[model samples]
Target: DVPVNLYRPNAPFIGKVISNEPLVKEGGIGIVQHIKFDLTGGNLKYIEGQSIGIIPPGVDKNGKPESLRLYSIASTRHGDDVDDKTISLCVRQLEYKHPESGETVYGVCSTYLTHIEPGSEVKITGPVGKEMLLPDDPEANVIMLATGTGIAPMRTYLWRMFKDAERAANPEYQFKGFSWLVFGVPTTPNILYKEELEEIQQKYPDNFRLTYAISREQKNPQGGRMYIQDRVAEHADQLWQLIKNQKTHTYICGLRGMEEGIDAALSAAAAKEGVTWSDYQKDLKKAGRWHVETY
Candidate 1:
């Protein structure tokens, strides 16, 4: 079973930061990072598609203690090291200009994590959430849609399915099925985990396919910013065909607004055969074939 709340905020695990590496390239839009934490002394095991909670230190402006924030797990249960002794998360620091003074404001937790140093202790909770768990069938088809740091669980899913070290370690779960990822980002430089994802596509061409919706650099046929749902429209018919199969599973993550557009595009595809997209989607959800975690 998928683990939920293996560690709790009341008594969280004291994990140490092992590395906090920048994911975005030089010309990327924001400060995004891939952080790994040391879990050698704890039994914090988790599978792909789960999330973990972070209990930030100190109090808020009102003097209330900082509360827990959950982040989607970015690496597999085996971790990026394949040592099974560490866990990781991907985060994009939140920055916005204040409407009143126009002064830049930083996200409390986002800033804390981006500036955190290696070897620093972090109060971590969980191995939580079961909503995004993977199917055990090795030959299952998975269609992953993600954007921003919403790529977290998608990374975990891909790493476990296609990474060399991960495949080697999990002999019992070899992925011989088709997997596709449609990732959305603002620019080419903003594609998170760019090089690592390349290695997988280069090696597993038959099993994995990648598509990127670069809103700034690329344009849809209508000459608008190419969004994730736009790309889905481009291949809605094919995707709908795949969705018709019982073995296929689709995941949607990232910015919440994209969800409606995606549904609209697929709705047209479902319409081609005299079916109501909404009703058919209810069946997919009933069978647990469709999953969504957009926020």
Candidate 2:
């Protein structure tokens, strides 16, 4: 049987629709839906690397019920406080073409979030992800790994860190870890939140870095669609150096495939440095240096 947390009761919720524009303002099932909602008047307190579990309504596929899926929280809690409003989530509709029916199947959570009208009430559970939270330490170094919609929590982490740093006390003030993001996707259209990323990059060019691994893009090396893990492999030494020397924390989010690939590569990277891969991973886990979330 599934656990209680997975099917917990839906809390008092609300969603504010800011935009329902097509991803490209053209054809196709892709869309960028902007969502905003107050979390029980600031009752939804969360750190940088956490996710809010949304209780999506079951979808009727030919009268069969399919359940909801979780998406990482993409907004910093400080944004809600500063703006005195709700947070935002950038979601991409995952549409699959059915073979026999020749119809498109919409994803459960994406459809539910996009279908909500402005001022509509929406319900979800606690800020419930363990892998998405930022470190409580102000000086921790951060290495974020994500692809597609997985970039959600990394963006949220950075936003909250920097936003809070602005108002941090003089003696208590210490910068959060250096932030780096590696993102992968099949196409540029699948690149979920480029504008927000660009804005953050412009604001803190030194603190942020982004690497895009486009598996299907023509610009891909050798014309090959590459996974983010491949890029991580290419830069394993640099990544290892950052992780070990700086004591950086790593966050991973996306598909099971990406997580597996990364874990393997991290093992290999540690092995090359003459350390047991499992030992290296264990140390990180014990130090709370490794974080992950996959669907």
Candidate 3:
């Protein structure tokens, strides 16, 4: 019964930006925003772990209308306000240097979304994807690993699992399980949803654990930038133990090419127990315990 394709690119349902706030504070490395849209009158329903398509207004280099860009929905099915009338996304403004031109280029969709004014109309489509959906069992252990804006879906999961407002809203889904989040970012300010995340963790120390990999601020054992992979390696044994439990689910989101390093770490851990990491991962996939959405 999960909804998908309620709206499409050709004629997207119009929605209004309820708020577009910067997630990064001063001294942060890049631009990331948490934007909420009003879906009051539409049938555009979504659940946790889904993504939505936003059709930015403009043409591509070929001079055709811009295609819809997909972003992971950052709010639960009830939305940020715990009401059914809204949806939210976390977006990072894509900025990269053009190799030949040696000039900075801003992302069309990202720029439009980050700079969009509140109360302005926006074109939105789809409540897409089901692979990343949160498990229904309240006591199931959830492990989330995310980098930068990839924290979107993880946020929705945490909100549903720990946030007081969300807990109150979801009577059938009170979370009483262990949850952990390993988040990686460049700097302290770059840690999106820092306040909200910490608050919940503090309130439920026994149930929630939080870890951070701040590349610029932290160092590895050899004295280098501490990336997410390094953090996984640091805690591989504990993570491996958790993964052995049938009720435990692991999710990895954001950034590309990180799996190799993660696998390397887990492989070492698994080998110590005479289990092949890849083979165990295949079994986990068959059991729907390993979920990943990276770009």
Q: What tens-digit string does per-residue lDDT give for candidate 1 at 258-292?
A: 88988999999999999999999999998999999
Off by over 4 Å in 1: 100-102
Provide the global lDDT of candidate 2 against the true structure.
Answer: 0.66
lDDT of every predicted structure (CA atoms): 0.90, 0.66, 0.91
Candidate 2, superposed: residue stretches over 4 Å from native: 1-11, 14-29, 40-42, 57-68, 99-102, 163-176, 218-223
Ranked candidates, highest TM-score first: 3, 1, 2
Model 3 per-residue lDDT tens digits across residues 3-46? 88888887788999999999999999989999999998778988
RMSD for all candidates, in order, please: 1.1, 4.4, 1.0
Q: Over all chains combined, what TM-score does candidate 1 have?
A: 0.97
lDDT of 1 at 74: 93
Better of 2 and 3 by lDDT: 3
TM-score of each: 0.97, 0.80, 0.98
Please provide, for model 2 over 1-295, each residue's C-alpha lDDT reduced to its tens digit, 9 standing for 90 to 100. Answer: 1112432443434444544444333332256665666554434555455655666665475875444455666666654445535556657767787793769877777877877776666665555656455656667778888976777777777666555443452235355457788888776766666676777777777777778887766343555568897888778777887888546888888767787677677777778759876778778888778887877
**Evaluation by TM-score, superior candidate among 1 and 2:** 1
The clash count for each model shown is 0, 7, 0
Worst 10 residues of 1 by lDDT: 97-106
Candidate 1, after superposition: displacement of residue 278 in Å?
0.7
After aligning candidate 3 to the native by TM-score, how far in Å is the CA of 128 from where it should be?
Answer: 0.8
Error of 2 at 281 (Å): 1.0
